[PDB]
Ligand binder design. Structure first.
Ligand SMILES: NC(=O)c1cn([C@@H]2O[C@H](CO)[C@@H](O)[C@H]2O)c2ncnc(N)c12
Length: 529
């Protein structure tokens, strides 16, 4: 239900209930037939699917206890460390003990035992994770199968129908230019029906073509799609115009980290501020790494702020999804920001992102790159040489803990680098530099940023065309470009679209059923259109 955006001069279109009008359920037969009935996707990962399955569960006493447990576990994870024994024991009594009325029997008895014991010792935020998966293992059975036959899944099919409607020229309205670079420019845009504000990243087809950037543009879209993170820009819509390809991303107008680091006039800022940014970047990094995707482009300009002062990683073009167990090569990135193992063309994993985190913390505190000056005339090959053969030094601006984490992230050997061990990100989160940071609360948006930005305002002439247009394809014998345009423009992206519907409360308002125990007319089979 909560606001956020580039400022909104115009709200929901007042015909929006017509625009988003449910199809009659009889028009959903094709969806019903083709849809992959997959529990995690339909009942968890997809935000409206999860809401509707939860609505189904609350009609059944036997199912609802499982949902309540899952919610309690969510509460447990954000509980302060010193109260975890209390919260954990309450969940034990309430849920995992047979005498309780809200007892859930499908969590295995030896799982309960293991959990009891882990709780007896020092409790960790992840205490109930095994019980949680056990619960989902049960819900994806008969409960799922009953949900699929309910009116709440019928209603999911109706939402999916709306989700998949084409993007057209009437989908969006256009506001000012936000910025310029890369293949194109970025402007504010707004979905008319829902009123949600986004950033439209406009890549010029001519510039993609001359630079041979098709693969990079396609890679960007496809990684964006598959990562859903509070700390990485999300992709809501991907579509075509006559001259451009458009990515409708999370609007982050707070300015980028390059600006904020060098705006002070005394570059570098408070460690408390640096710490907060670093912690969120790390979460963003862990979310990418969960997809076994390495970002490989970490630099201050690719980190953007929102009007709230939270950050997101942007510009995923150089990111690569690595096959499980594989390693990749290739020397990509920005000068001064590339890790030794990238520079030496070795095979590498997630490791460069951690080196990149080191650069960012360093530059945030010192105000300068570790291996370069900002005003400096120096050749690329010299900056590279510094990165391989010299060690950075640390001024009085660094606390001991800051110097330590930077040195451990800026470890040149990737094997010994912080966060590159078996613990992965967890090793970095537990570092003394972060000792006061509860990352679970951070991931849940429960901690306030120490700094609120002036939202960026650029002056720019351009009214640039972001109106959707599907060009006629195949005009030339060579249709490679055209194939790439068709591949790219898949329209709305499921999860962000659904969250948009929820956040703007289009979901809450539109999602309604009959007066009491009845179907609404759009679900009434006896009266088709
Ligand atoms: N590539 C992106 O995701 C964005 C780039 N800009 C602006 O365009 C500049 C160059 O990309 C940035 O510094 C911002 O001013 C953005 N502004 C708002 N949201 C975004 N999601 C971006």
């Amino acid at each position: 239900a909560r606001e956020g955006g580039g400022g909104k001069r115009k709200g929901k279109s007042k015909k929006w209930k017509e625009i988003l009008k449910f199809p009659h359920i009889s028009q959903c037969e094709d969806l019903r037939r083709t849809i992959d009935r997959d529990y995690c996707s339909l009942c968890d990962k997809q935000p409206i699917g999860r809401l509707l399955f939860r609505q189904f569960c609350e009609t059944r006493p036997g199912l609802e206890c499982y949902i309540q447990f899952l919610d309690s576990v969510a509460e447990y994870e954000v509980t302060p460390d010193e109260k975890l024994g209390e919260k954990g024991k309450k969940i034990m009594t309430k849920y995992l003990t047979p005498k309780s009325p809200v007892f859930i029997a499908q969590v295995g008895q030896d799982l309960v035992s293991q959990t009891e014991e882990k709780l007896l010792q020092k409790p960790c935020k992840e205490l109930f994770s095994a019980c949680a998966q056990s619960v989902h293992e049960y819900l994806r059975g008969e409960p799922f199968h009953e949900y699929l036959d309910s009116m709440f899944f019928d209603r999911f099919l109706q939402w999916k129908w709306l989700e998949r409607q084409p993007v057209t020229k009437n989908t969006f309205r256009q506001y000012r230019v936000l910025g310029k670079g890369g293949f194109g420019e970025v402007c504010a845009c707004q979905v008319r029906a829902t009123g949600k504000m986004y950033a439209c990243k406009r890549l010029e087809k001519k510039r993609i073509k001359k630079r041979k950037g098709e693969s990079m543009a396609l890679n960007e879209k496809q990684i964006l799609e598959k990562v859903n993170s509070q700390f990485v820009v999300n992709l809501a819509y991907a579509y075509e115009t006559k001259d451009a390809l458009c990515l409708v991303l999370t609007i982050m107008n707070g300015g980028d980290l390059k600006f904020h680091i060098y705006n002070m006039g005394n570059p570098g800022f408070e460690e408390e501020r640096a710490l907060f940014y670093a912690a969120e970047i790390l979460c963003g990094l862990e979310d990418l790494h969960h997809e076994n995707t390495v970002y490989r482009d970490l630099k201050p300009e690719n980190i953007l702020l929102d009007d709230y002062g939270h950050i997101r990683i942007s510009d995923l073009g150089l990111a690569v999804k690595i096959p499980e167990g594989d390693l990749i090569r290739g020397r990509v990135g920005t000068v001064g920001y590339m890790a030794p193992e990238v520079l030496n063309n070795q095979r590498y994993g997630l490791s460069p992102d951690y080196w990149g985190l080191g650069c960012l913390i360093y530059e945030m505190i010192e105000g300068q790159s570790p291996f370069r000056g900002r005003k400096e005339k120096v050749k690329r090959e010299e900056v590279d040489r510094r990165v391989l053969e010299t060690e950075e030094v640390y001024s009085h601006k660094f606390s001991e803990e800051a110097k330590s984490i930077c040195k451990m992230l800026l470890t040149k050997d990737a094997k010994q680098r912080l966060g590159c061990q078996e613990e992965e990100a967890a090793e970095v989160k537990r570092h003394p530099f972060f000792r006061n940071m509860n990352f679970k609360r951070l991931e849940a948006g429960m901690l306030d940023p120490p700094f609120v930005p002036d939202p960026r305002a650029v002056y720019c002439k351009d009214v640039l065309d972001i109106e959707q247009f599907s060009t006629v394809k195949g005009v030339n014998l060579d249709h490679t470009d055209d194939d790439f345009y068709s591949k790219f423009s898949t329209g709305s992206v499921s999860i962000p679209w659904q969250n948009e519907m929820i956040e703007t409360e289009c979901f809450k308002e539109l999602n309604v059923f009959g007066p009491n125990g009845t179907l609404p007319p759009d679900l009434n089979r006896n009266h088709p259109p």
